[PDB]
Amino acid sequence: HSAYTLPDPLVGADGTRVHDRATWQHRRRPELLQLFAREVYGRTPLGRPEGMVFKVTTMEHAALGGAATRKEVTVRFGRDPNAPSMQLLLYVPNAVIARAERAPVFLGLNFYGNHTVHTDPAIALSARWIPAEAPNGANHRATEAARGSDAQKWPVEQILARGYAVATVYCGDLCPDRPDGLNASVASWLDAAAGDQRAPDAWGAIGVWAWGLSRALDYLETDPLVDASRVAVHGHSRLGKAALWAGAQDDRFALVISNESGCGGAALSKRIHGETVARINTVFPHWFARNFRRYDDHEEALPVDQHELLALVAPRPLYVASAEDDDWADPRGEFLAVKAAEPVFRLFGQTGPSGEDVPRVNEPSGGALRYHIRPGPHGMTAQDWAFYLAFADEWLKSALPA
Ligand SMILES: O[C@@H]1[C@@H](O)[C@H](O[C@@H]2CO[C@@H](O)[C@H](O)[C@H]2O)OC[C@H]1O
Ligand SMILES: O[C@@H]1[C@@H](O)[C@H](O[C@@H]2CO[C@@H](O)[C@H](O)[C@H]2O)OC[C@H]1O
Ligand SMILES: [Mg+2]
């Protein structure tokens, strides 16, 4: 649509313009984080819980034909062996380990279980609930036929060959992706209420998923094989909504990738196009705060829009990408959010897409703030990853000190 106006990221709530990087970082950034927490995603009640324990359950030094070390880590959210946990899978390129250099990392959540990212028969088969839409499941549990069922979204061998570790966690370890899933999620025990319905500003699945990414980063900071200052957080679609909210809240993430995150991710909500606030909240009432429902059919009242979420990543490199046929995500709305975030990146001396309108397919545009659109439907393809790997080579924090 063409009948909206956006709030200016560089004007504070009180009307005073943001003229320097220090004002952005110390005043405007907290102001915008609070607006998103209260009105959109809900409040993250705390970060790392006390007594988080990391247990390496398996470590294989000759995975993928010798190309990788594969570690499985249980990240347990409390010292009691009964405490809730999540299962992290890490592949690290053996070429980099052998050189005794710490590897940079791509970290993102997976849709249907760690065993779906690669056929590798040694990955632990998740025993947690999975959605009916997961390929090759039965009775909401994974089967052996589900191994590698999502490998098309995870070019592990290529990422490793280019020098990067691959870390992942099943989103459903943190919040099962079902409308009732919060009652079996992190939110059900982390600073939980004594009873009754969740409060208007209480976080939902996207907040919980984002929090899990930050807990994975807490683990990576302890692993001698990796450089936890060089972690690119990425996600596809609903898990890209989570990646953006994680990268915005947690400035330790060195680079952020939104692959087709759409509504409530990179796409402008005020631009009424494809999925709308009412449709996302109606179909997925667990994803956002209950407060976000106030904007159902009333996006004009939103005090922020998603360009300000993208701006919260600055000055760190941010990639937003779309698919040409993916109308529901609103590709032009994703691009326009990038353009409306660009002035903040520019304040930090970075540059964004330089063209007038959505670029031609498979021609990325921008510096540390980058956009591309590829042909085809919603998905995450080898072409997307080729562009992300080039971006990481150029813009991920270097291993060398300043
Ligand atoms: O944020 C919400 C939590 O406050 C909620 O916590 C539940 C409250 O009722 C108690 O009987 C339960 O033990 C407790 O888990 O869980 C859902 C979450 O959305
Ligand atoms: O926010 C987006 C969701 O609205 C979208 O939901 C899909 C719409 O197509 C249906 O056929 C699917 O069942 C449903 O998953 O998923 C992508 C997400 O970004
Ligand atoms: Mg939309």
Author numbering: 31 to 432
Quoted passage from the original study:
Glucuronyl esterases (GEs)4 are enzymes able to cleave ester linkages connecting lignin to glucuronoxylan in the plant cell wall. GEs belong to the α/β-hydrolase superfamily and possess a catalytic triad common with serine-type hydrolases. OtCE15A is an interesting member of CE15 and the α/β-hydrolase superfamily in that it features acidic residues at both the canonical and noncanonical positions (Glu-290 and Asp-356). Here, we have investigated by mutagenesis the residues involved in catalysis and carbohydrate binding in the enzyme OtCE15A and, furthermore, present a series of structures of OtCE15A with different ligands, including monosaccharides and, for the first time in CE15, di- and oligosaccharides.
